[PDB]
Amino acid sequence: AEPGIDKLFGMVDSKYRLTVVVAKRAQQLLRHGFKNTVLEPEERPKMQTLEGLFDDPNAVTWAMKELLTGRLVFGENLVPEDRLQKEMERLYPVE
Amino acid sequence: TSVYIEDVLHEFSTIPGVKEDVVEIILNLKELVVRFLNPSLQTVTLLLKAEGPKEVKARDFLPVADVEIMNPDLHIATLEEGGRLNMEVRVDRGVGYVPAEKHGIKDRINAIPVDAVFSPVRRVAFQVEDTRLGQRTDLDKLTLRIWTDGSVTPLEA
Amino acid sequence: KKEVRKVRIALASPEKIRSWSYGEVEKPETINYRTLKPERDGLFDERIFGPIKDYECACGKYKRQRFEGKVCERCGVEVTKSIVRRYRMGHIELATPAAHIWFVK
Amino acid sequence: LSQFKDETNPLSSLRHKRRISALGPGGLTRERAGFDVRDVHRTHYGRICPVETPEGANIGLITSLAAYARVDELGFIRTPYRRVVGGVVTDEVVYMTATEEDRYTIAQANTPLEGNRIAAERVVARRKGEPVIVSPEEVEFMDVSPKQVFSVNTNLIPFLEHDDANRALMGSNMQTQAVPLIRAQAPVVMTGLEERVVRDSLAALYAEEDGEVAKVDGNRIVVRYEDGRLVEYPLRRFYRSNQGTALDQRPRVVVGQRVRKGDLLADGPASENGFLALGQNVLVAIMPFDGYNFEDAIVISEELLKRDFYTSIHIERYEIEARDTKLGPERITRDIPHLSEAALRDLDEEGVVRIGAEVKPGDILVGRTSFKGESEPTPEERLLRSIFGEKARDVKDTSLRVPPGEGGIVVRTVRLRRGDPGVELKPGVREVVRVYVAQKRKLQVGDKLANRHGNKGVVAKILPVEDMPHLPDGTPVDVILNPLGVPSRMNLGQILETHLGLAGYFLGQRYISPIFDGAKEPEIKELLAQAFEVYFGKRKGEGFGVDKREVEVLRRAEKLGLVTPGKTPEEQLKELFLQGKVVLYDGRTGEPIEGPIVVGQMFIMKLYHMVEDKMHARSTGPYSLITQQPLGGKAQFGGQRFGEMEVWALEAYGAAHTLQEMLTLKSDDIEGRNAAYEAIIKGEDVPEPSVPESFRVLVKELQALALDVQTLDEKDNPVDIFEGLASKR
Amino acid sequence: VAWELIQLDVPQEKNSLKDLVYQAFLRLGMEKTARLLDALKYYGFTFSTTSGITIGIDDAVIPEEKKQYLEEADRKLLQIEQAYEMGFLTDRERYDQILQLWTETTEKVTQAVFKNFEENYPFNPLYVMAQSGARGNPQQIRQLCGLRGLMQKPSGETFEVPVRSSFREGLTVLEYFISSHGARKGGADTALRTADSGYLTRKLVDVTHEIVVREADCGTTNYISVPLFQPDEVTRSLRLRKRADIEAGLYGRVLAREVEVLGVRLEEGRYLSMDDVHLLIKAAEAGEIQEVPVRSPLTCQTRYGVCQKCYGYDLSMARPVSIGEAVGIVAAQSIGEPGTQLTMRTFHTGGVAGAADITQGLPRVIELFEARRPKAKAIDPHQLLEAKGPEAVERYLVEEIQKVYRAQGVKLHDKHIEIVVRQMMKYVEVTDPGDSRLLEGQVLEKWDVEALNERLIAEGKTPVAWKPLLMGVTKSALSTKSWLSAASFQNTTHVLTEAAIAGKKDELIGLKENVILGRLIPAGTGSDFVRFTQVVDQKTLKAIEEARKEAVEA
Amino acid sequence: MVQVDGGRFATSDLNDLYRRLINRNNRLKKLLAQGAPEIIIRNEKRMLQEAVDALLDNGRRGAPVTNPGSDRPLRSLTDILSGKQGRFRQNLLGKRVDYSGRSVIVVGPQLKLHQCGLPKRMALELFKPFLLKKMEEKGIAPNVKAARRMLERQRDIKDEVWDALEEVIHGKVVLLNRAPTLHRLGIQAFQPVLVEGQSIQLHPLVCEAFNADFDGDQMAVHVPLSSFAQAEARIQMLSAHNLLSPASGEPLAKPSRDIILGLYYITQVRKEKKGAGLEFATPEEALAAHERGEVALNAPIKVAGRETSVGRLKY
DNA sequence: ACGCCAGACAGGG
RNA sequence: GAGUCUGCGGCGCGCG
DNA sequence: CCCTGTCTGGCGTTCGCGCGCCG
Ligand SMILES: Nc1ncnc2c1ncn2[C@@H]1O[C@H](COP(=O)(O)CP(=O)(O)OP(=O)(O)O)[C@@H](O)[C@H]1O
Ligand SMILES: [Mg+2]
Ligand SMILES: [Mg+2]
Ligand SMILES: [Zn+2]
Ligand SMILES: [Zn+2]
């Protein structure tokens, strides 16, 4: 199946919430630039025509791989709706 | 590997004065077993042309220096009268099975490729019968019977 | 740009009929063969309903987008794609009233 | 009532012709009225097949007639019944009306008879739809034969006696769907009507009178009858069947040959030798492999492809017309206005494609030139044309191309120009152009095959002869059928066909087992006893005896209960062979298969590959005019239906957006799909759905009716679905 | 942990395996179970090929006792005839008695054939597939080695004469033609039965689609009590309900109240694992509990929707239900499939009794979801509601409904029938007005709203006296609040007529209405509980805090 | 009002009705203005009312027919809005997906529940846009329109395209559907493993969920476009993730007919012959004697001998 | 043709 | 800097 | 005028796909 899906399922209060989180995460992953990640260095996402998955294969595949770690934070109202998209474009470069 | 009937264009045609259809012919060709003698012969095109009230067998092919035909009496066709059959059938050295679709040979533009049948062996069989050696009766004896279309011999194989 | 949150069915006021309406079909004239164009006032006239074609009008006085919101001087044709032609509604002014069978039977 | 002649094989058509229907004028009987009509009545005996009734909604209403069944003077399917005066049966027969049949006491054909003499005091008879044990003295009439009970299509089933009526149905139906193989082989085990089929059908070409053969062409066989007359018999070379199957008459008589009255000169589309043939006789091992042969799924040997054993021909008739537009006549010419010569080679003759040309999907079969717009040129395309070369054939490329899927080689071409001979060219239609394309189809994984009994199944894997199950002697098995598919299903007739077939393989002979009267378990064991000597006898003389393997399997076999313990391996294997099973080695490991496995000559046919077989995958394409839902047809596949049941499926899951997508971005959201595409092209994140045209069309459809449906805001206030075309002016 | 959940003391049957996967599911985890699934898949396939099991005509082995039992019953037939030829047995008794002779004699050859294999051929190719959850049916194998004996006439009256043959030996000429009638009548059966399976599903879905999990533990602690014992099999003798059915009732449910049973304290709200339901059964065996207090959709508070503690465990997953799940639908789909699964497999494969079983159920499950006086007045719900009250009807419908599915092999959790049947009583008639005239049928919970604020917030206690109304699934869908939903099934014609007249504002809630629009689903990712959820990186967390720090002016 | 074939024109029957109403209403206006003899005015008002019914609902009162050709009730508005294949049903069930596929299914034994065998030839059409862009990211194609033309013909595909598609589908998943979708497992998500041919390789264990068996039946296939749909599809929809059934808490990934038969055979114990003494339980002479008696032909390796049949004593 | 629901009117106090 | 127009309603049969 | 009963009037009746024909 998929990497630690049960680990992931236990991390959220409701099944369908994890789904929304991963999805919204995959969205930002692409929009503000694909380098908006929290665990790229040593062991990270990878494909094999070359090791090129390091750049842009599957968005959510990363989101899950990150949420599996304890770096990200998902809440009902964590950071004010509009101020987030502003600070995010200010710090992340790829366009 | 390929065939070329002079007046024929497609594989689904029928030639006058010839009972068999191109498809039945090309089929009978897959049955022809030839045997060349050296690497220098990678691709040999056998030529044959017969006319009139004669039966076309594999021995009718004009003989080529380093090539031999171990399938002489194979029936290629039955010509009635005014039966004009002039063809060129290519022959190659390869391995395994190669669908006519995979190689697509084109000596002549109107020629039609044929399914490749490369094993010189039709069937193998082995038996392991107990044999007795003075001390311990529990022993194996292998005897394998090999059949070959003639191209190569059982021992060579 | 708002979100659709409630739908509502309400009977129609004669005036609302006309309100949604554009032109009145007053004759059974579909299309005249010669020219596969709308006959006269007919069930297909472009006035009452819209531009049979893309951005072009009937006769061709005005044919592109530059003058997208104006009507042709001799023939009446305001034009968006033939899409405006499929969304617009026409009306028929009945002589003596009749009634919705939907509410009667 | 008139439909496409089902000519998968002449048999198919013949059946389609004799199947009895209720529905019709509309005056007689309608479709949601008929539980009493649908049932198979008593008198349907030898007048209507009780199995030919197609499975599906339309059922029971349609059913082919029986064997000897024949409409007398007035639509009363009379059935043949022989007279029996006293204890004496006659060779005289009376086609009787169904009413008259109830007045007499009739008996079955199974009654022991010494000639004219009944043989048992208490022998079976049926008064009126009621089983009755009658005395030879009361036996007024007897049935003619077991065949009459059933239809033609059904009488072609081997041991129909051992198969469950319901599973037999499938058998009969399957035949009607048999596709003509270049290599036609009659069954290893037949019923007795294969001959009669092709002959009463007009598959094969029979000799009228006795005579000798003059010319044997591939197109005609001119025979010379002994009456001093000679006739030229053309042979339908390659014709297009309504269903697109090939119909060729293959001469089977050599030059100068005395022919018997009524002998096949040429074989029909699917006849081997005057025998009906749909599919071929192949050695088959009835054991389970990895997962390849699933419950209904079945395997296949690459060796079967090597010799064209399961190969068939399909011809298609593509057609195109040169219409007359008021924009300018659509011309047919070699001129394909915009890009290459590489695509114009095959189009040798000015406009038409040259015969004997291999056309792959996407090639030009026929070239045609129509006009670019509806009535006006293009201001944007006017600047593009002028920049590189203004003088560009204003005409657009509207050429008949090979639709995705496939094409083969062009065999024939038809063109009807201006001065028509005696043809009926439709109005506006300037000229037409037909392009027949043929292609050789080789048995592949997707295909489906089935035996006359009922085991149906698709090919799961084409294994190389290298490692499939092989017999002690190098002869490997052709197909491996899964056992599990026969317990639950009741049709041991198949297991009975494989046993006698086994015999026929080593005894080099075909057999004919009647319906209920055919071969019997003892008689088969007998023939099997004769095959052992051919099998194991040659082995003894050829020089070798038994294997470590062959003996190992015997151990486990005695411990099983198949061979009497204490007898010689030679005698035991015989006993085991009689049981219909022989030892087989894996082929992949050379190890045997612990436990004897039956094997034999089973007749299996290939089922017609409809365009429902040739799969469909759609990315983007056409849309419906009134509804804005995706639709295909010609070259663009067409979208799949998502049905509410499936909706519910996603609904169950938290598949929100997945559900939205389906209802918006993928089908109806006009603006959505568009933006959707571009977005994906860009590798962007798809925009947020706009209103679905379906709702819009709904709204208005509802507005058509008095009702006014309006969308509202947070506070009961408007919101607009129709972005802005609703406001007036 | 592998040997703890495996039974190596018997041949692995589909059930022993079925049990292993389930165990593995709960014990080791979802994906770990998936691994085991493929593992058994692989080895099962491999070993299958090597085992060399294959059918052979001879494999089908006929018992020697067949000839006996046939003759034994044969001579007995002659007794019954002579008993008739004298005038003792009435025309009827004759018939009823002959049938019973075969009904038993057949069942006799049945166990016989198996007895042969059991003792003599343990590894008969045909036998192993049936025992293993592989393939085969006891009534099927009988028709091959034993003999399929009684095939009824066109009408229904079974034939006086049986079918003495098996499929091993030639089923004769006329015995085939007679069997043929039974096949014609069947094929038709599945067609109507398939149409009512979809009927059952559409109805269930049309009434139960708005029902969705959106909550907080609903504080209303009122519940249903699941009975562990059954009254009259034999006049009056209390008995422990069958294992399977009891499991069905309390598996993965939520205790409405705390129960102290054999020594352990089952706390309130705790989700009872199958191990727990094993405990309670063992206790009832001892005699400590006769019913069980458990949360059920049957007593939820959430007007529109069901909470997490009321529903239970079973999401596709084995842990408690996750908020925003489309339960009702799942239920509806689950009742549809079983209908569409059982009548298509019975016309297709085998006999007498089964034909009656399927045809009697489909009519009964259509009369049970829709409210009407049953054929033979079985008992009528409307009247029963009036005389004995609601809480009994609810528990009656549920159990009476499980009765047909248990009897047909299907195993569906009571959960589902509940969600449905609750909606059949989400409505009530009025007897004492306040806001609108008396005779009216309206939303139960909508009355709870009126009465609530009528006595609590605004004074003047105007009791809104209602009567529990038991409407059938069908009628509930027909007449609901929104029109969009109603415009979908009954009469688009009617549905809209009324909804127009009275300017109806379809507030979009529920999946059916909201789908039509092609709008996001109010449930799932649209679920109000999670439609809004943001994600952050510790990097963007500090950044936004730097924006709040710059808020300090000069 | 469309041009069909050869000059045939198709129009929605509504138009016929509309005419009806139009003419009557006109004819009425003129009949009131001309002169109005009572009889003929009502006679017409009658025809008019009727006509007004025709467009809205036909059949509630008599059934109008297109002139002698088809005694068919011209589809009235009411009709266009009511029914199984109606408009209200059309919306509800959302009928036709843009990224869908359907082919014959075939067992794929080595495949894991996690994946499914999907024909590459099919994957190409389905994942066409997703590939077109991937073509540009690599050197196989300059632009989109270029990438399109590169693939409009089968003989034009460079092996390089396959590598691209195989790369696009990396971790995306697709949904499979079966003929009657009875329950939620009626659709499952799997990881496509591009394969050659026409057929689609399905896993055996799920063949229980979908009531499917490789005999003439065929399964459809869809693809999640949004990163969101993708997420849900692979997290909560994937086959392997929906192991228990919604009906019962009992598994649905139960080994089927094939697997059970294999796993059974391997675990069953055999019994054979007891003619001479079966009591090893007590004597030590019983061990020796019946151990040699077994070596002989009297006692089998599996003898009904309580404690241990000689089969156990020997090994 | 059927089955089912819901309905509007007519007969017996 | 490509995009129009055709495939509709019904009937018959066949798959699973 | 009431309640009960009886014929009466309206709707629904799997799901998707192939092919071929016809105005
Ligand atoms: N009239 C009909 N309506 C709907 N589906 C039908 C149908 N006839 C056949 N089918 C469908 O296609 C399948 C064909 O039947 P089978 O393959 O025999 C299923 P089954 O129940 O597994 O029987 P089996 O165990 O003998 O294989 C059924 O599952 C059913 O879903
Ligand atoms: Mg099945
Ligand atoms: Mg099936
Ligand atoms: Zn103008
Ligand atoms: Zn609750």
CSV table of C-alpha atoms in Angstrom, one decimal, chain D residues 427-624:
chain,number,residue,atom,x,y,z
D,427,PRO,CA,-28.3,14.7,-53.3
D,428,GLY,CA,-25.5,17.2,-52.6
D,429,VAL,CA,-23.3,14.2,-52.9
D,430,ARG,CA,-20.9,14.9,-55.8
D,431,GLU,CA,-19.1,11.6,-55.7
D,432,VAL,CA,-18.3,8.8,-53.2
D,433,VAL,CA,-15.2,6.8,-52.4
D,434,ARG,CA,-15.1,3.4,-50.7
D,435,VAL,CA,-11.8,2.0,-49.3
D,436,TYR,CA,-11.8,-1.7,-48.2
D,437,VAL,CA,-9.1,-2.5,-45.8
D,438,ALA,CA,-8.1,-5.9,-44.6
D,439,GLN,CA,-5.9,-7.1,-41.7
D,440,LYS,CA,-4.7,-10.4,-40.3
D,441,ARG,CA,-5.8,-11.0,-36.6
D,442,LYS,CA,-3.6,-13.4,-34.5
D,443,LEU,CA,-5.0,-15.0,-31.3
D,444,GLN,CA,-4.0,-12.7,-28.5
D,445,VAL,CA,-4.6,-12.2,-24.7
D,446,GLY,CA,-7.7,-10.0,-25.1
D,447,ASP,CA,-9.6,-12.6,-27.1
D,448,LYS,CA,-12.1,-15.1,-25.7
D,449,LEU,CA,-12.6,-18.8,-26.6
D,450,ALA,CA,-15.1,-21.4,-25.6
D,451,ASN,CA,-16.1,-25.1,-26.0
D,452,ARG,CA,-19.5,-26.3,-27.1
D,453,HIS,CA,-20.5,-27.2,-23.6
D,454,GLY,CA,-20.3,-23.9,-21.8
D,455,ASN,CA,-16.9,-23.3,-20.4
D,456,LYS,CA,-16.2,-19.8,-21.6
D,457,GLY,CA,-13.1,-17.8,-21.0
D,458,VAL,CA,-10.5,-15.3,-22.1
D,459,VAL,CA,-6.9,-15.8,-22.7
D,460,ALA,CA,-4.8,-14.7,-19.7
D,461,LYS,CA,-1.3,-15.6,-20.8
D,462,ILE,CA,0.5,-16.8,-23.9
D,463,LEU,CA,3.1,-19.2,-22.4
D,464,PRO,CA,6.1,-20.3,-24.4
D,465,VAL,CA,6.2,-23.9,-25.4
D,466,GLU,CA,9.5,-24.0,-23.4
D,467,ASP,CA,7.9,-24.5,-20.0
D,468,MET,CA,4.3,-25.4,-20.3
D,469,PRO,CA,3.0,-28.8,-19.2
D,470,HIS,CA,4.6,-31.5,-21.4
D,471,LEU,CA,3.8,-35.2,-21.7
D,472,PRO,CA,6.4,-38.0,-21.1
D,473,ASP,CA,7.1,-37.8,-24.8
D,474,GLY,CA,8.1,-34.3,-25.9
D,475,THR,CA,4.5,-33.4,-27.1
D,476,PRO,CA,3.5,-30.3,-25.0
D,477,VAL,CA,-0.2,-29.3,-24.2
D,478,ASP,CA,-1.9,-26.5,-26.2
D,479,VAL,CA,-4.2,-25.0,-23.5
D,480,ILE,CA,-4.5,-25.4,-19.8
D,481,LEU,CA,-8.1,-25.2,-18.5
D,482,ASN,CA,-8.9,-24.5,-14.8
D,483,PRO,CA,-10.7,-27.4,-13.1
D,484,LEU,CA,-12.6,-25.3,-10.6
D,485,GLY,CA,-14.8,-23.9,-13.4
D,486,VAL,CA,-16.5,-27.3,-13.8
D,487,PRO,CA,-17.6,-28.4,-10.3
D,488,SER,CA,-20.0,-25.6,-9.4
D,489,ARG,CA,-21.0,-25.5,-13.1
D,490,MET,CA,-22.7,-28.7,-14.3
D,491,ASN,CA,-21.3,-29.9,-17.6
D,492,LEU,CA,-19.2,-33.1,-17.3
D,493,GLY,CA,-19.8,-33.6,-21.0
D,494,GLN,CA,-16.7,-31.5,-21.5
D,495,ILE,CA,-14.6,-33.8,-19.3
D,496,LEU,CA,-16.2,-36.6,-21.4
D,497,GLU,CA,-15.1,-35.0,-24.7
D,498,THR,CA,-11.5,-34.7,-23.5
D,499,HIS,CA,-11.3,-38.4,-22.6
D,500,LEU,CA,-12.5,-39.8,-26.0
D,501,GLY,CA,-10.4,-37.1,-27.6
D,502,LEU,CA,-7.3,-38.4,-25.8
D,503,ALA,CA,-8.1,-41.7,-27.6
D,504,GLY,CA,-8.6,-40.1,-30.9
D,505,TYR,CA,-5.2,-38.4,-30.6
D,506,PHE,CA,-3.2,-41.6,-30.4
D,507,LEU,CA,-5.6,-43.8,-32.3
D,508,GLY,CA,-5.7,-41.2,-35.1
D,509,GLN,CA,-9.4,-41.1,-35.6
D,510,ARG,CA,-12.5,-39.0,-35.2
D,511,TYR,CA,-15.8,-40.1,-33.8
D,512,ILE,CA,-19.5,-39.2,-33.7
D,513,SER,CA,-21.4,-39.5,-30.4
D,514,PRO,CA,-25.1,-38.9,-30.7
D,515,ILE,CA,-27.2,-36.8,-28.4
D,516,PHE,CA,-28.5,-39.3,-25.8
D,517,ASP,CA,-27.7,-42.5,-27.7
D,518,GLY,CA,-23.9,-41.8,-28.4
D,519,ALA,CA,-20.8,-43.4,-26.8
D,520,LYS,CA,-20.8,-44.8,-23.3
D,521,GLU,CA,-18.2,-44.8,-20.4
D,522,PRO,CA,-17.3,-48.5,-21.0
D,523,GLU,CA,-16.9,-48.0,-24.8
D,524,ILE,CA,-14.6,-45.0,-24.2
D,525,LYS,CA,-12.5,-46.9,-21.6
D,526,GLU,CA,-12.1,-49.4,-24.4
D,527,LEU,CA,-10.8,-47.0,-27.0
D,528,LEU,CA,-8.5,-45.7,-24.3
D,529,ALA,CA,-7.2,-49.2,-23.7
D,530,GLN,CA,-6.4,-49.2,-27.5
D,531,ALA,CA,-4.6,-45.8,-27.2
D,532,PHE,CA,-2.4,-47.0,-24.4
D,533,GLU,CA,-0.7,-49.5,-26.7
D,534,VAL,CA,-0.1,-46.8,-29.2
D,535,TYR,CA,1.1,-44.5,-26.4
D,536,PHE,CA,3.1,-46.9,-24.3
D,537,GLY,CA,3.6,-49.6,-26.9
D,538,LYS,CA,5.8,-47.5,-29.2
D,539,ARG,CA,7.7,-46.5,-26.0
D,540,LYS,CA,8.5,-50.1,-25.1
D,541,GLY,CA,9.8,-50.8,-28.6
D,542,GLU,CA,11.4,-47.5,-29.2
D,543,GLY,CA,13.8,-48.6,-26.4
D,544,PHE,CA,12.8,-47.2,-23.0
D,545,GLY,CA,10.5,-48.0,-19.9
D,546,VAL,CA,9.3,-45.9,-16.9
D,547,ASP,CA,10.8,-42.7,-15.3
D,548,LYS,CA,11.7,-41.9,-11.6
D,549,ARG,CA,9.1,-39.3,-12.1
D,550,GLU,CA,6.5,-41.7,-13.7
D,551,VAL,CA,7.0,-44.0,-10.7
D,552,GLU,CA,7.0,-41.2,-8.1
D,553,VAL,CA,3.6,-40.0,-9.4
D,554,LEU,CA,2.4,-43.6,-9.2
D,555,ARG,CA,3.2,-43.8,-5.5
D,556,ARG,CA,1.2,-40.7,-4.6
D,557,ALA,CA,-1.4,-42.2,-7.0
D,558,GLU,CA,-1.8,-45.5,-5.2
D,559,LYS,CA,-1.9,-43.7,-1.9
D,560,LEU,CA,-4.7,-41.7,-3.5
D,561,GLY,CA,-6.9,-44.5,-4.8
D,562,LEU,CA,-6.5,-44.4,-8.5
D,563,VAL,CA,-4.4,-47.6,-9.1
D,564,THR,CA,-4.8,-51.0,-7.5
D,565,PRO,CA,-1.7,-51.4,-5.1
D,566,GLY,CA,0.5,-54.3,-6.0
D,567,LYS,CA,0.4,-54.2,-9.8
D,568,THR,CA,3.3,-53.5,-12.2
D,569,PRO,CA,4.0,-49.8,-13.3
D,570,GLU,CA,3.2,-50.9,-16.9
D,571,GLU,CA,-0.2,-52.3,-15.8
D,572,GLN,CA,-0.9,-49.4,-13.3
D,573,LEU,CA,-0.3,-46.7,-15.8
D,574,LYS,CA,-2.8,-48.5,-18.1
D,575,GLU,CA,-5.3,-48.5,-15.3
D,576,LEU,CA,-4.5,-44.8,-14.8
D,577,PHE,CA,-4.7,-44.0,-18.5
D,578,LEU,CA,-8.2,-45.6,-18.7
D,579,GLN,CA,-9.2,-43.1,-16.0
D,580,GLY,CA,-8.5,-40.5,-18.7
D,581,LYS,CA,-5.4,-39.1,-16.9
D,582,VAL,CA,-1.6,-39.4,-17.7
D,583,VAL,CA,1.5,-38.2,-16.0
D,584,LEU,CA,2.9,-34.8,-16.9
D,585,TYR,CA,6.0,-33.0,-16.1
D,586,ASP,CA,6.0,-29.3,-15.2
D,587,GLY,CA,8.1,-28.2,-18.2
D,588,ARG,CA,9.5,-25.4,-16.1
D,589,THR,CA,11.3,-27.6,-13.6
D,590,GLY,CA,11.0,-30.9,-15.4
D,591,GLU,CA,9.5,-32.3,-12.2
D,592,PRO,CA,6.3,-34.2,-12.6
D,593,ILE,CA,3.0,-33.2,-11.4
D,594,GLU,CA,2.2,-35.2,-8.3
D,595,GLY,CA,-1.0,-36.9,-9.2
D,596,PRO,CA,-2.3,-37.9,-12.6
D,597,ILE,CA,-3.8,-35.2,-14.8
D,598,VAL,CA,-6.3,-35.8,-17.5
D,599,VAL,CA,-5.6,-34.4,-20.9
D,600,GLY,CA,-7.2,-34.7,-24.4
D,601,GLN,CA,-8.4,-33.4,-27.6
D,602,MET,CA,-11.0,-30.7,-26.8
D,603,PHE,CA,-12.7,-28.7,-29.5
D,604,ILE,CA,-12.5,-25.0,-28.7
D,605,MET,CA,-13.8,-22.1,-30.7
D,606,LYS,CA,-12.9,-18.4,-31.0
D,607,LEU,CA,-15.6,-15.9,-30.3
D,608,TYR,CA,-16.3,-12.9,-32.5
D,609,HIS,CA,-14.3,-9.8,-31.6
D,610,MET,CA,-16.9,-7.0,-31.6
D,611,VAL,CA,-15.8,-3.3,-31.5
D,612,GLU,CA,-16.7,-3.7,-27.7
D,613,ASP,CA,-13.5,-5.8,-27.5
D,614,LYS,CA,-11.2,-3.2,-29.1
D,615,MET,CA,-11.0,-0.9,-26.0
D,616,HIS,CA,-11.7,2.8,-25.7
D,617,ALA,CA,-9.7,5.5,-23.8
D,618,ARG,CA,-10.7,9.2,-24.2
D,619,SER,CA,-8.6,12.3,-23.1
D,620,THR,CA,-10.5,15.2,-24.8
D,621,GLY,CA,-12.9,15.3,-27.7
D,622,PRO,CA,-16.5,16.1,-29.0
D,623,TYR,CA,-19.4,17.2,-26.9
D,624,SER,CA,-23.2,17.0,-27.3
